[PDB]
């Protein structure tokens, strides 16, 4: 996935690794990040509020006044926590540069309305002469920007970026930065990404449970993904596969239960018993914290698997359900299962034998039942 990074992190990467392809003396690493537990001062919470030309005494005045401030951005009401402090660069000119990728290569965008430069995947930047640039004002300042955007592409290409935007820049100094890293690049970027961590989107607070699942997902080729949408939500899901989990969410929203949808999750790529056990323990934990009047619903669905072993995965699911037996009865939880795939009959047998001793309703289905039929069966009845 593409993960957005703080302007602090992007500018730190730039001032460190860009003076390797270019003679980038023009930019220094003069950056300071202010968090909840820690001149130009602006929020660094992945936005689109900026305090320009101020003293440090005036900067501490803005910080204390805006720290913890309740603000609505994108319909989301969250508190202001992260801010960037950097030197004020007095400028006249204002140029834009952005690197994004398409199916045929990378596209460089430049403006002073916008010119586009396509860099082929196999040919690279060396195969390109920049006569495609804007001549209008780029006279004395054309060979320098040609050289800089050439270096920026090399920086984009070698540092595993999925998106970079300098909007704007002046003389060669970056003023505002927006960046996304392809998180799949992690293994190849251990040294360049050393000083950074991916931030949570504005409004959202980090989840100990979500980070625990992300931790399991990192030590396997299999997929274990969990996103809490509503902790107080009635409808909980443990769906196998990326494709199917989206479809189960579509059906719940289509029945008008978008609000009750407690989470978006996914497991696939044949995870072992231990991995599925820890995942199921996490989901069960979160759904047994609060007691709801009309109870709670757990949908253990998925398509007919190609290689994910239903016996091994459901053995992990059964083990967690056995452990949460008291908390399951007390929270009025109803379990609905629909599964197909390798050794499914053995897996459904485990779930049927469990429902006959646990003391909670467990409705068990196979490939004969339509994939998403357990959704209306649980939400309409």
């Amino acid at each position: 996935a593409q993960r957005g990074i703080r302007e602090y992190d992007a500018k730190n990467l730039l001032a460190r690794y860009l003076p390797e392809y270019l003679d980038d003396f023009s930019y220094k690493g003069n950056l300071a990040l202010v968090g909840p537990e820690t001149l130009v001062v602006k929020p660094d919470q992945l936005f689109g509020l900026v305090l320009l030309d101020a003293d440090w005494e005036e900067a501490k005045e803005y910080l204390n006044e805006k720290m913890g401030l309740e603000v609505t951005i994108g319909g989301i009401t969250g508190r202001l926590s992260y801010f960037l402090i950097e030197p004020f660069t007095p400028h006249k000119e204002e140029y834009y540069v952005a690197i994004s990728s398409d199916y045929e290569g990378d596209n460089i965008f430049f403006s002073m309305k916008v010119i586009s430069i396509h860099v082929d995947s196999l040919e690279g930047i060396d195969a390109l002469d920049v006569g495609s640039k804007l001549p209008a004002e780029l006279g004395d300042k054309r060979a320098l920007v040609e050289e800089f955007i050439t270096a920026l592409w090399r920086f984009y290409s070698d540092t595993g970026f999925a998106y970079v935007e300098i909007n704007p820049f002046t003389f060669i100094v970056p003023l505002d930065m927006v960046a996304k890293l392809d998180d799949a690049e992690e293994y190849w970027q251990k040294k360049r990404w050393s000083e950074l961590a991916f931030p949570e989107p504005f409004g959202r607070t980090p989840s100990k449970e979500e980070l625990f699942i992300k931790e399991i997902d990192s030590k396997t080729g299999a997929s274990l993904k969990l996103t809490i949408l509503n902790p107080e939500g009635r409808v909980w899901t443990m769906v196998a596969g990326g494709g199917a989990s989206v479809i189960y969410a579509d059906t719940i929203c289509d029945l008008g239960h978008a609000d009750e949808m407690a989470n978006y999750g996914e497991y696939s790529g044949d995870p072992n018993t231990e991995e599925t056990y820890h995942y199921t323990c996490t989901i069960l934990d979160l759904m047994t914290r609060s007691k709801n009047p009309n109870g709670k619903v757990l949908l253990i669905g998925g398509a007919i698997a190609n290689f994910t072993d239903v016996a091994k995965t459901f053995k992990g699911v059964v083990m967690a359900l056995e452990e949460y037996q008291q908390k399951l009865q007390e929270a009025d939880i109803e379990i609905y299962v629909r599964r197909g795939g390798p050794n499914y009959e053995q897996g459904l047998k485990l779930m049927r034998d469990l429902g006959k001793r646990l003391g909670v309703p467990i409705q068990v289905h196979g490939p004969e039942t339509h994939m998403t039929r357990i959704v209306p069966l649980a939400l309409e009845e």
Partner: protein, 616 residues
């Protein structure tokens, strides 16, 4: 033909030792009545050799190569590579396969491949007129002809979805799991798929959905196209533009998943790396609407997908575009043994019983006791032997006695039979293990076995009530030296320290030393003849071990007799003397000792005569 990806003559390499995936491919070839397996070779980066798998109920051999160029040179007919390398190796291996002149298609299974690497693979593929299916896919299949690895799961599922014969539907999805659900949906609402491909859920695939849709448009066998997309990216807009430009004339069923997204936060990244709508155009709603407006057959929701497929298939039947097929013979493969056993379908008798240890569970057990409990309780080596050999939790004096015996018998110099043989084997340049066994194999009635004889003879005399004098007398009459009695240099005035250390410990710590009390009465009688007729080390071990067992209280007379008969005592000598044997072997290795040859003058050659060797 260019539009054909795989046929019944397709030969492939499976990169990565994926035994289940290999078996799945072969099982499909078998149920499809293929003449030959779809796999020419396996590429195993750790090892070259052979792999055995089934062809129905018949076992076959597949060759196994360390590298892609070596396999390609041996099997040039194989034009497909099924790549099971991890996301850390997927690029290098796919790129190497694409550089091979004989390979045309690479299916990349790995999830978590960088977007740049996928872009470079896709571009490399397009430049060389090759195909990359994936990354992050199961693959796809041509019904009744070829399957990519695990595509379409179990043989039961292949049979239930009738994938052993082609239909008229050309299917393409992003999702691997949904490709299998789609196979089931389509078989129930039409004549089934002809071919199905999952391009993967990555933002930058090796091949886009349209690449496959265009192949289906050229294929005469396919009369119907069906696809299942998702939110994020503009891939589906290649299809809608091709549909608008009349590049797709065959009826196309289309559904884009991710209708949930506008109801939830804009920050939500879904399962697949590419499943996140950055713009409004990238949403499932904008995609399904543009599909409807382009002339595709779009259902109300995923629930109605099959219904849409049924409607389009029926339309082809009315117009006579599709001809009615007769259902071919339903194929059959026996259940795998491991499945039958795991489900409890069968019961299988065990060949062996084991009562001393269990490595099956969460933790290793020694006589039913967890190893962590053995070590947390400081049971020691003697305690471990107590569990593994006697199936007892021995008292502290018994476990320490076992450890004392081991130290005492550890070595007796290089001259004794065992050490001597190990030294000769070590001097011959043999490894430690061979040299050790060469020495251990001398342990028996004359070297080490006086221990078991002293336990047996003394126990019998003392049990049957024989007075020490009567036992000494009886043995003399039979002409049998008392085992455990006698020494070459040591005597009453000059005792063997090994004996003294053992007798003193037993006298001080054993609850009972009844057989030792008897042996000392016997010893008074033998030393009254010759001073060197002392109770030796071997006698001491055998006798005190009977006393240890009598002191434990948990052994009956019979149990004790069994211990003597089975040679537990030879084992204790073997265990302890292996220390000195290993020591001697290592010592000759440190010294760089040469091959031994026994001196010629130490041998009296006494050849028989010509007359003596004759047969009458």
């Amino acid at each position: 033909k260019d539009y054909v990806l795989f046929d019944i003559n397709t030969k492939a390499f499976v990169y990565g030792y994926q035994t289940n995936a290999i078996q799945r491919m072969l099982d499909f070839d078998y149920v499809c009545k293929r003449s030959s397996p779809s796999i020419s070779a396996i590429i195993n980066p750790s090892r070259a050799g052979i792999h055995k798998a089934f062809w129905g109920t018949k076992e076959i051999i597949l060759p196994m190569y360390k590298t892609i160029p070596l396999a390609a040179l041996a099997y040039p007919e194989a034009d497909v590579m099924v790549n099971f390398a991890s996301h850390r190796s997927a690029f290098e291996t796919t790129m190497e396969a694409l550089k091979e002149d004989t390979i045309r298609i690479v299916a990349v299974i790995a999830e978590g491949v960088p977007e740049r690497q996928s872009r470079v693979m896709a571009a490399t593929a397009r430049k060389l007129d090759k195909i990359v299916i994936g990354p992050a896919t199961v693959g796809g299949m041509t019904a009744g002809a070829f399957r990519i690895g695990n595509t379409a799961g179990t043989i039961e599922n292949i049979i239930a979805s009738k994938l052993y014969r082609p239909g008229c539907v050309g299917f393409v999805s992003k999702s691997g799991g949904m490709l299998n659900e789609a196979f089931n949906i389509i078989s129930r609402n039409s004549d089934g798929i002809y071919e199905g491909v999952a391009i993967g859920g990555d933002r930058y695939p090796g091949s886009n959905m349209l690449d496959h849709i265009l192949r289906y448009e050229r294929n005469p066998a396919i009369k119907m196209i069906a696809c299942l997309g998702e939110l994020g990216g503009e891939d589906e807009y290649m299809i809608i533009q091709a549909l608008k430009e009349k590049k797709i004339t065959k009826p196309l069923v289309a559904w884009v998943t991710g209708t949930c997204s506008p109801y939830l936060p804009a920050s939500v990244q879904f399962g697949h790396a590419g499943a996140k709508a950055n713009t409004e155009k990238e949403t499932a709603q904008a995609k399904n609407d543009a599909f409807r407006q382009a002339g595709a057959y779009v259902p109300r929701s995923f629930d109605d997908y099959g219904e849409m497929v049924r409607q389009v298939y029926d339309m082809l039947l009315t117009r006579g575009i599709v001809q009615k097929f007769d259902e071919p013979e339903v194929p059959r493969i026996p259940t795998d043994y491991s499945k039958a056993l795991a489900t409890g379908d069968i019961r299988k008798p065990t060949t062996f019983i084991c009562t001393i240890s269990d490595d099956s569970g969460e933790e290793l057990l020694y006589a039913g006791k967890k190893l962590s409990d053995v070590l947390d309780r400081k049971m020691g080596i003697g305690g471990v032997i107590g569990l593994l050999w006697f199936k007892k939790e021995l008292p502290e004096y018994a476990a320490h006695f076992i450890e004392l015996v081991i130290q005492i018998v550890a070595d007796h110099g290089p001259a004794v039979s065992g050490a001597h043989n190990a030294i000769v084997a070590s001097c011959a340049g043999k490894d430690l293990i061979s040299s050790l066994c060469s020495g251990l194999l001398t342990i028996g009635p004359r070297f080490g076995g006086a221990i078991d004889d002293a336990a047996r003879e003394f126990k019998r005399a003392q049990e049957t009530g024989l007075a020490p004098e009567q036992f000494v007398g009886e043995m003399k009459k039979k002409g049998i030296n008392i085992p455990g009695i006698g020494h070459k240099i040591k005597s009453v005035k000059n005792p063997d320290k090994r004996v003294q250390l053992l007798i003193s410990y037993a006298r001080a710590n054993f609850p009972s030393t009844e057989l030792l009390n008897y042996a000392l009465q016997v010893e008074e009688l033998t030393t009254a003849k010759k001073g060197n007729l002392i109770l030796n080390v071997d006698g001491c071990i055998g006798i005190l071990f009977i006393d240890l067992m009598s002191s434990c209280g948990a052994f009956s007379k019979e149990e004790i007799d069994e211990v003597v008969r089975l040679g537990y005592l030879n084992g204790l000598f073997a265990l302890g003397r292996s220390i000195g044997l290993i020591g001697h072997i290592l010592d000759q290795k440190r010294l760089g000792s040469r091959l031994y040859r026994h001196p010629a003058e130490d041998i009296a050659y006494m050849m028989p005569s010509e007359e003596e060797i004759q047969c009458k």
